Ligand binder design. Sequence first.
Ligand SMILES: CC(=O)N[C@@H]1[C@@H](O)[C@H](O[C@@H]2O[C@H](CO)[C@@H](O[C@@H]3O[C@H](CO)[C@@H](O[C@@H]4O[C@H](CO)[C@@H](O[C@@H]5O[C@H](CO)[C@@H](O)[C@H](O)[C@H]5NC(C)=O)[C@H](O)[C@H]4NC(C)=O)[C@H](O)[C@H]3NC(C)=O)[C@H](O)[C@H]2NC(C)=O)[C@@H](CO)O[C@H]1O
Length: 273
Amino acid sequence: GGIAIYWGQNGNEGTLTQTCSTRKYSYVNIAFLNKFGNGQTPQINLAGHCNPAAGGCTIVSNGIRSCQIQGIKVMLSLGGGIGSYTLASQADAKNVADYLWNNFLGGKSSSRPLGDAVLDGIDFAIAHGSTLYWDDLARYLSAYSKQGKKVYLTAAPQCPFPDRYLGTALNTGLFDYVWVQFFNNPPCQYSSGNINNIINSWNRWTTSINAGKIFLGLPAAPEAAGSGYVPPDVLISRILPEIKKSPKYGGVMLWSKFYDDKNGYSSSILDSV
Ligand SMILES: CC(=O)N[C@@H]1[C@@H](O)[C@H](O[C@@H]2O[C@H](CO)[C@@H](O[C@@H]3O[C@H](CO)[C@@H](O[C@@H]4O[C@H](CO)[C@@H](O[C@@H]5O[C@H](CO)[C@@H](O)[C@H](O)[C@H]5NC(C)=O)[C@H](O)[C@H]4NC(C)=O)[C@H](O)[C@H]3NC(C)=O)[C@H](O)[C@H]2NC(C)=O)[C@@H](CO)O[C@H]1O
């Protein structure tokens, strides 16, 4: 399979171009558009990378294009651990979808946050706030694919199944890639010497929802999360030999680029993925 990586939440983690040039990642999720819905003006946060104001982050289009010519799919990630993002109604889901189309996809806007580049799809990283209308957002975004270029849909639900926020959206069967986050959740993550909870959780996710491919989401280092880190050797010798048997296995997802370089995680597991 391949490795999905989250980029954008630490200005010291290198440029998007450099991130994709590593040749270790097959998918890149730009984190995050952490503010939108309920009449709020959508706002993107890319840590210390760039200030989105006055097209200060339009330079990112160079990284997006650089990744795409290298066959890497790049998605805009909605939500994240911090933000006032939400959906007040189905009408809100429509407005956000139309906004996303014109500002990140094949639509048109004089103020596209990340430039003129056209993202491959949208990533759902909904962790809090509204538990409703995310299935509507997915449906509206997916319909835009009928205009010629497919709008990919990906999701980063936490490992507890079903996910309280993305459960219904995932039930639509419209998602291409689902990287379940097996961390910051004791009941379904790795614990010292115990892989039972993570494997058991993996089985729930791969024998339920209809998605293109399912990935094993993990923290790139102990610092990347409150808990759930898995040493490279354990992942390679105990976990991968099992989950790779599943025909839905798509690979591994890591949070994040910054911690990945610091701990050299993907550098150690890439060939086994
Ligand atoms: C898929 C998923 O759900 N993933 C989650 C994941 O979200 C969790 O990780 C945590 O995510 C949150 C975001 O949701 C991370 O929060 C980051 O934290 C950054 C570090 O503190 C912070 O970056 C700072 O951003 C400032 C702007 O807001 C930057 O300041 C600017 O600096 C410029 C010079 O560099 C200067 O010119 C500007 O004037 C100045 N502007 C301002 C306003 O100060 C600052 O430089 C930058 N710092 C760095 C180091 O880049 C982000 O703002 C903040 N994001 C948000 C949206 O608030 C949090 O760090 C993540 N934690 C970890 C451990 O990774 C993850 C947790 O395990 O769970 C996953 O499931």
